């Protein structure tokens, strides 16, 4: 007798996914959604290297530490590298007031220019620009000091009021720096600055802020017992800025016309600058992917995939891989898959006096690679892109919005790594549902065309009653099956 | 001959929803979500009307800029507008130290009520009160001064200490502002004050601040070389402020009693007000609506739709619309939809001798489910009721920076869980109309056995003769096989 | 003479919800949501609280007269507030930066008081007798703190000081001081002598320099004067050197840190009992393996995630239906066997001479059990929550943290909520599709040598015996001889 089996795909994948009812189930084809590879190197972001502070922090930078020289002539960058650990900071002990203000700042800067705010040869006339080196700032074996600042004393026995200004004409903002000094006795302070009660005022249109000397006993901090406190402002274009002291003022040398950026962003990282080129960088190294989610950082610069917390996000496509269910024809009457079918998802087994084969049936085939491919591109595209994580930090005095932030971070965080595998392990078992349910449809299509011309076999095959040649058997194939005829 | 058909409806609708296996889906019925309609205006909140500063911000307002008349007799809100055209706040210039902290605390109050905390004519026999006026806040033409702070000089080239109380008897917090006036030279210290070295002191049971004038030489804003820094404290009730000073104090004059409320806010808006009244606002316009979801603005007062992202938010209820599946009877076997069909969701046509007939009971028992499903989400989606403004000065970036990641982190959620939620509905609800109209078909199916012809497309052929009568009893689930059977 | 298929049913009047229906009664099912406690303050992992009382942390750390029950104080597992602390900072002034200080101490697992300047030997040239005040009285006299000294002038000189402290501890040291603030000049005068006086404190991360503000001021508790207080963390190794020439409470007692992990500061009326547990929150412990609780959002330990759900509750056995998607389950099977005791799927036979099918039965056992793990395994449990507080100055801050906790409330309950009624409507679905699977396996197996009654059942033609029975529930049906 002559026979047309349903039957449907089977391969030698090993690919495993997950479902609410099972786990490691075998499946024909699937799609993995979590990047965990990376290059391991800092990489260009769209054409652009960042710039790299090397042994230098943020303020060893910006102040110019003498030890930083090699970063004088940066210009523009894509993102901001500290190394774990710099070594190279506010080399003259002190506090850095609004540090972390300010490194939110430069977060959003592209581009800046340093120049000289307070030309060093003529801004001074009645005052010493030459004495102002120490051992806390040393460089090549001698006392220096910073690049950017400039550490006026007395010319004489003398130290008049000084009113210098200047007017921001860079059509950006100015990002000006000055430091206040504070002697360890009055000795000292008029030995430097003669007039033993002085003050440090700097005003321009919205900063107002005044200094006095506070003279006192301190610890030595690198044998060092004096402080020196470092300031900031950002100056309006067009506005002015004007400083006036009798004493201790650590003046602008250089200040920095700032170009404001999207996309930027401070990272701490101890990997190695390639000339590689990437959308999507990391501390650990860059990522070069399509897929929606990734395990590699949660800091992110560029266009990156999301990051969370998973080893595992992996949607299955085809069936269960079966060689030899809710709608119970998959792994249900129909007990195994085909490999001998390498043309399709679902089709038909015949054989006849002419012989045997397999088809595939394209129409369900089709319409189930096209449910399931909307059904892929539709996940990935609700998953939005990660853009350039901003960095958070607070200093010893902001534990509580420390604390705040991260967990605002780690709540994210956990919602997306639920979000991201729920999804997943619901439309995993959806997936082989809808395969169970076209391989059902299917079968009872090729029932309704027989009716009583054939008997069921039990295990999705159909024994013909009459003589069904490859001509006959197209007919059932292609659902025209002329049931009078016999 | 005769034939009974067992079918599904369809009817004009261009409706269209998506699934995650299909979009632009044409169905029968189905209810938008997404509110994405307002009124373009200001209106009333519950019956109240906001407060409109108009070309005045919050400092303008509360110290009584010159130019802020028109709001002195405010009493009481349920919103506060400011607009993006403020040109009056601080007519003399210098910092307001908190500022945004004092319009946080503003954000929760209903109604205030300005009174003379220190009578200007009794307060400060010691002191010139009249000579306390400026060109930077002229009015008319004319030097003035705000209208809540008083400007003390010397009299008779001498300035003594002051000392002045007030006990807050008012059973509400008392809201004290005042000022320290910086002068850009001694000479101009002395000529105001006489005394080349004074401070101002300002102490409560709970604050506790003082003041030391610095001169220095400054740029001019709005022509002035001068500073003048406004603060603000909040008074207990039953307590006691006390100020001291031998200069440069911009006395209090008039204060505010605070009343605490709930659900206003601040907001910036350039729409206009109108006698429109609204249980919710937005700075683009009042929303009148009952959908669970909003796209027209994340700031809300009110009672509001929660905010999403989304363009469209729609959830099919009625079936995939075929006009003249996973359980593979729509689009399936039964390959078509009846327009014919008006009185349900799933019903039969029949041709004998002698008409389209919806099934109550099969589709009575959908419409119960899908109208549960579709409140059962809408429920789920909590109302948004008045969201509160966050304002940051230029040294607080990083934590304007962290609000931003909160309200952004927070939005992303909502659209994906609004966008997902509906997607996998939409499925299942086509699911359920595909199982329904397939477990109809086997009922009816097994109502008949071999006393008709499965003719394969829903139809059943009738071997015998089946009248209107014969016809009912299928609908009605009373089929008398037995009796048919003998009528062949 | 009748073979039947069937599902169980049992007395069970439980209930959950799906999304297209409300009050399903179903025969198993298993609560997601603890809401059980034991109103009572216990042990965490063996080691009690410190339990402040009466005293708010101000209080504690300063030495407060009224704390003194405290001063032996050495390692907790967390720090219990109680609602309205009348004793603090008894001597009024401002304690700058002390939600700050509450915040450092919410990690720390123990410290050690010890005598930082010992009071009878570190200040020759200064009076350290006279500092007592009827603002921090005790036992009926005048009083101060324990951990603070008011140095004030001997004599009529109030020479210049300094002092220094090598943190040789090995670890953090918490330091304390205050500044007191006289009424007068008068007072400023009898008390340190110098007019004009100044506070220094400096270590190689601290610096700061303090005025004495002298003005009137309104009376706290009948003191018109004032007293601020500061702190630092001293590092290990680091020195911290005071210089004064007036107004300086120095420090007397300081604190030793020692860090851990997983403690907190809560605000709890509830009282300590001998309990121990692995789940502590303000209302009382918690003894659950649940994912999730609506008894506090506060939590010490290790916890079930808070929601605000009032009920969360999981189907897993089927609808109850005693004397759907796939229509066997309250459709063509219109009812339940309560005589069914051995499992979900089965037959009941009649011969002439229940059990229930163990393979679908299984099967499903499995998939219900994987399904409810796989829920719970995703609801990672809450681990300490940190509490927050802010000063009258930082509203902003309050209101952004309020609304992040409230933010993550609402996507955490609507999660669990949603999760729940999707998987139930899946479940119920899932047995519905067994029994139509089961049914149609037996309608296959015997064919056309039974009659198909409509109830599930199937009258045979022949006579069907045990061991003929068996064949049929075994799958092993020998059509053939038939
Ligand atoms: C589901 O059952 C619960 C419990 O029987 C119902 O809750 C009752 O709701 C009414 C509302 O007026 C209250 O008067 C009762 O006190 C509630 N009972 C309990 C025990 O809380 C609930 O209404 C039912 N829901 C539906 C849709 O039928
Ligand atoms: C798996 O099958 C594919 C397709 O038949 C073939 O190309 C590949 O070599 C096979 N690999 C193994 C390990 O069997
Ligand atoms: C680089 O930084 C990572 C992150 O802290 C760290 O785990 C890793 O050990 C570092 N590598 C080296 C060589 O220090
Ligand atoms: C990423 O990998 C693909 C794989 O072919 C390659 O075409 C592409 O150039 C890669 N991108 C980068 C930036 O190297
Ligand atoms: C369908 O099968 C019949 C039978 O062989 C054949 O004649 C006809 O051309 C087929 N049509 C298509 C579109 O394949
Ligand atoms: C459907 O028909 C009704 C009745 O004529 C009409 O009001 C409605 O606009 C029609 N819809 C479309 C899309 O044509
Ligand atoms: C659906 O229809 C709209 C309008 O006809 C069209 O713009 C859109 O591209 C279609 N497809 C999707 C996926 O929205
Ligand atoms: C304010 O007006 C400008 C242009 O006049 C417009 O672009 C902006 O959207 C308006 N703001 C609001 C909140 O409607
Ligand atoms: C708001 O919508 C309702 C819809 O029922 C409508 O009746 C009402 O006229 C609309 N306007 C107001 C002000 O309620
Ligand atoms: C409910 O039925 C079970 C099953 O035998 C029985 O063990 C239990 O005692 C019954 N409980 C009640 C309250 O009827
Ligand atoms: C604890 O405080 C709550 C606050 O509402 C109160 O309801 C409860 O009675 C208090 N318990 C005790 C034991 O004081
Ligand atoms: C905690 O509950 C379990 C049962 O849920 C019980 O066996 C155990 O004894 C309980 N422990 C305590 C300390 O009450």
Same mark, same amino acid.
């Given at each position: 007798?002559?026979?047309?089996?349903?039957?449907?795909?089977?391969?030698?994948?090993?690919?495993?996914?997950?479902?609410?009812?099972?786990?490691? *189930?075998? /499946?024909?084809?699937?799609?993995?959604?979590?990047?965990?590879?990376?290059?391991?190197?800092?990489?260009? +972001? &769209?054409?652009?290297?960042?710039?790299?502070?090397?042994?230098?922090?943020?303020?060893?930078?910006?102040?110019?530490?003498?030890?930083?020289?090699?970063? +004088? =002539?940066?210009?523009?960058?894509?993102?901001?590298?500290?190394?774990?650990?710099?070594?190279?900071?506010?080399?003259?002990?002190?506090?850095?007031?609004?540090?972390?203000?300010?490194?939110?700042?430069?977060?959003?800067?592209?581009?800046?220019?340093?120049?000289?705010?307070? =030309?060093?040869?003529?801004?001074? =006339?009645?005052?010493?620009?030459?004495?102002? /080196?120490?051992?806390?700032?040393?460089?090549?074996?001698?006392?220096?000091?910073?690049?950017?600042?400039?550490?006026?004393?007395?010319?004489?026995?003398?130290?008049?009021?000084?009113?210098?200004?200047?007017?921001?004409?860079?059509? &950006?903002?100015?990002?000006?720096?000055?430091?206040?000094?504070?002697?360890?006795?009055?000795?000292?302070?008029?030995?430097?600055?003669?007039?033993?009660?002085?003050?440090?005022?700097? *005003?321009?249109?919205?900063?107002?802020?005044?200094?006095? =000397?506070?003279?006192?006993?301190?610890?030595?901090?690198?044998?060092?017992?004096?402080?020196?406190?470092?300031?900031?402002?950002?100056?309006? %274009?067009?506005?002015?800025?004007?400083?006036?002291?009798?004493?201790? +003022?650590?003046? %602008?040398?250089?200040?920095?016309?700032?170009?404001?950026?999207?996309?930027?962003?401070?990272?701490?990282?101890?990997?190695?600058?390639?000339?590689?080129?990437?959308?999507?960088?990391?501390?650990?190294?860059?990522?070069?992917?399509?897929?929606?989610?990734?395990?590699?950082?949660?800091?992110?610069?560029?266009?990156? %995939?999301?990051? *969370?917390?998973?080893?595992?996000?992996?949607?299955?496509?085809?069936?269960?891989?079966?060689?030899?269910?809710?709608?119970?024809?998959?792994?249900?009457?129909?007990?195994?898959?085909?490999?001998?079918?390498?043309?399709?998802?679902?089709?038909?087994?015949?054989?006849?006096?002419?012989?045997?084969?397999?088809?595939?049936?394209?129409?369900?085939?089709?319409?189930?690679?096209?449910?399931?491919?909307?059904?892929?591109?539709?996940?990935?595209?609700?998953?939005?892109?990660?853009?350039?994580?901003?960095?958070?930090?607070?200093?010893?005095?902001?534990?509580?919005?420390?604390?705040?932030?991260?967990?605002?971070?780690?709540?994210?965080?956990?919602?997306?790594?639920?979000?991201?595998?729920?999804?997943?392990?619901?439309?995993?078992?959806?997936?082989?549902?809808?395969?169970?349910?076209? /391989? &059902?449809?299917?079968?009872?299509?090729?029932?309704?065309?027989?009716?009583?011309?054939?008997?069921?076999?039990?295990?999705?095959?159909?024994?013909?009653?009459?003589?069904?040649?490859?001509?006959?058997?197209?007919? *059932?194939?292609?659902?025209?099956?002329?049931?009078?005829?016999?």
């Amino acid at each position: 007798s002559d026979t047309i089996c349903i039957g449907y795909h089977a391969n030698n994948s090993t690919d495993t996914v997950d479902t609410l009812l099972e786990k490691n *189930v075998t /499946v024909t084809h699937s799609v993995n959604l979590l990047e965990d590879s990376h290059n391991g190197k800092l990489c260009k +972001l &769209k054409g652009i290297a960042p710039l790299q502070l090397g042994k230098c922090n943020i303020a060893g930078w910006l102040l110019g530490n003498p030890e930083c020289d090699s970063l +004088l =002539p940066a210009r523009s960058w894509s993102y901001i590298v500290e190394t774990p650990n710099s070594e190279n900071g506010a080399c003259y002990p002190g506090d850095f007031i609004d540090y972390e203000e300010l490194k939110e700042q430069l977060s959003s800067v592209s581009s800046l220019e340093r120049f000289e705010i307070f =030309p060093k040869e003529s801004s001074w =006339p009645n005052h010493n620009t030459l004495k102002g /080196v120490t051992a806390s700032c040393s460089h090549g074996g001698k006392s220096s000091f910073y690049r950017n600042l400039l550490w006026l004393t007395k010319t004489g026995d003398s130290y008049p009021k000084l009113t210098n200004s200047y007017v921001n004409n860079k059509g &950006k903002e100015v990002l000006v720096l000055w430091g206040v000094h504070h002697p360890s006795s009055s000795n000292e302070q008029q030995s430097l600055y003669h007039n033993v009660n002085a003050y440090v005022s700097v *005003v321009s249109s919205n900063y107002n802020r005044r200094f006095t =000397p506070e003279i006192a006993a301190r610890p030595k901090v690198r044998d060092q017992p004096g402080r020196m406190n470092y300031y900031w402002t950002l100056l309006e %274009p067009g506005d002015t800025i004007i400083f006036e002291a009798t004493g201790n +003022l650590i003046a %602008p040398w250089y200040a920095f016309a700032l170009s404001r950026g999207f996309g930027s962003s401070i990272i701490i990282s101890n990997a190695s600058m390639h000339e590689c080129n990437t959308k999507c960088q990391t501390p650990q190294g860059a990522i070069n992917s399509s897929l929606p989610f990734q395990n590699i950082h949660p800091v992110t610069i560029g266009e990156c %995939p999301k990051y *969370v917390r998973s080893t595992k996000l992996r949607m299955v496509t085809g069936l269960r891989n079966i060689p030899s269910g809710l709608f119970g024809a998959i792994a249900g009457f129909i007990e195994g898959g085909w490999t001998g079918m390498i043309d399709g998802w679902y089709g038909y087994h015949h054989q006849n006096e002419q012989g045997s084969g397999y088809a595939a049936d394209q129409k369900s085939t089709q319409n189930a690679i096209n449910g399931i491919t909307n059904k892929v591109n539709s996940v990935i595209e609700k998953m939005n892109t990660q853009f350039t994580t901003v960095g958070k930090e607070f200093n010893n005095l902001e534990k509580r919005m420390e604390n705040l932030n991260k967990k605002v971070d780690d709540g994210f965080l956990d919602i997306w790594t639920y979000n991201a595998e729920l999804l997943v392990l619901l439309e995993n078992e959806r997936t082989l549902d809808f395969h169970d349910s076209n /391989v &059902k449809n299917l079968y009872e299509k090729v029932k309704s065309q027989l009716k009583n011309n054939a008997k069921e076999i039990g295990n999705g095959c159909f024994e013909f009653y009459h003589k069904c040649d490859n001509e006959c058997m197209e007919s *059932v194939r292609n659902g025209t099956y002329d049931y009078p005829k016999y």
